[PDB]
Amino acid sequence: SITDILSAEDIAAALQECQDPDTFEPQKFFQTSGLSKMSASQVKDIFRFIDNDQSGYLDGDELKYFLQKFQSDARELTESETKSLMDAADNDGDGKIGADEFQEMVHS
Prior knowledge:
The protein has helices at residues 8-16, 25-34, 40-47, 66-70, 78-86, 99-107. By secondary structure, the chain is mainly alpha-helical.
């Protein structure tokens, strides 16, 4: 979902740095460790971190399930955590985070 092409250690720190239900559990994981200096392609694999697609794209509602996808026992990114994901790409006019949208953030 990310380890395809990324620094494994930096991931933990990247994630574990400020992680919490309101700081940036996914974005930090990606950015600090991986996204910071990665091409668009690998982002495809990274993108897989959050939701897979569900119906063509990921959305603020579903974003909480990203953990419930594999861990099927997540906390549901609380009210705040999904903000991270929401703010991850299509936040200003779609509230959805798709691979393309996600790629846009790193490319931004």
